[PDB]
């Protein structure tokens, strides 16, 4: 049954759209012998998978993640523990913790802007995104920006492990060395935070109680690592895509200046159009069949978020960037899956939208007469995906 189209083809990472359209039409559940996994490209099937945590569980993420996380991740948890600890993490980016974090993030943003304002250009990826994304996650958890350069050096090494399938021996040992180094840095701060309640997210995980029984320090490290990896890479890439997509559509870009309230819809449409998190794996727990494709217990299905968000069955003109989308104006609009859905849907969804709006408004207010200098982007990554560089000029 030779299927010659492959996710791992060279042309896919350059332009996955022709592969998106092919799979949804001719192979919605596509098998890749390279990693023994089926790739699900249709919106209706991805939604079904993520909303059925019993048929498609999250033990695949567990195994592949344990080496660098050192303990259990929220995705490996279920039932009361998942809810109690998810709610606990959310407390760190809501309520009073949110009101204290937001001014700091404004400062993080304005400090980056002041560094680059007098050279009349800035790289939203490499000058802002890579710096702001890691400092925001550090401010959320409660890590001092003293060592932000090395936190990034490590972070990237662990993200590679998570977002890469083919990893040789030399590449794997470095990702673990990064994990050990950051564990050596973070563990003493967890001991300090235990006695010193500074009211950050790490302190929340220490004050938490599971039937009058706090969680182990090694567990707190893994949950902190899970926040650091889940919050950094997505936020960086989304920001680059946002200003790129708007500047490539002057009408919509000017619409956003005239009505700054449209910024929330622009970010949402950006997240649908250029889904920064492209893949979500799941494990099949029992015999199941989509279309005519049979899956056996233990098979691995990989949701294709970017394809699902461009399904003609879910959106009219799905491959066009249109911030003016709405469900008021057959299935012309649907709810995208950029944050997944179901039980393991992103805890930092509301916080990501809020934080991304603050940055966009600030950039638009201080950088006057924004003009695009990177006329054509080059995107990389199939698990996490974003532009390599996105430079803009200003007065
Ligand atoms: C544009 C920004 C973001 C995007 C696109 C995104 C995407 C996602 C997606 C698709 C999932 C589902 C994973 C799965 O089903 O296995 C997820 C889960 C998660 N995200 Fe995000 N994320 C973003 C920002 C953040 C932020 C700021 C945080 C801060 C802590 C965060 C923390 C988490 C956590 C802890 C989970 C696990 C949820 C669970 O297992 O119940 N993410 N995210």
From TrEMBL:
UniProt KW keywords: Heme, Iron, Metal-binding, Monooxygenase, Oxidoreductase
UniProt xrefs under InterPro entries: Cyt_P450, Cyt_P450_B, Cyt_P450_CS, Cyt_P450_sf
* EC main group: oxidoreductase
Q: Does the keyword Metal-binding apply?
A: yes
Keyword Oxidoreductase applies: yes
Listed GO MF terms: heme binding; iron ion binding; monooxygenase activity; oxidoreductase activity, acting on paired donors, with incorporation or reduction of molecular oxygen
Instruction: List the SUPFAM superfamilies.
Output: Cytochrome P450
Q: What is its EC number?
A: 1.14.-.-
Q: Where does heme b bind?
A: 282, 344, 346
**PANTHER family according to UniProt:** P450, PUTATIVE (EUROFUNG)-RELATED, PULCHERRIMINIC ACID SYNTHASE
According to its UniProt record, which protein family does this protein belong to?
Belongs to the cytochrome P450 family.
Q: What is this protein called?
A: Cytochrome P450 protein
The organism encoding this protein is Staphylococcus aureus
What's the name of its gene? cypX_1
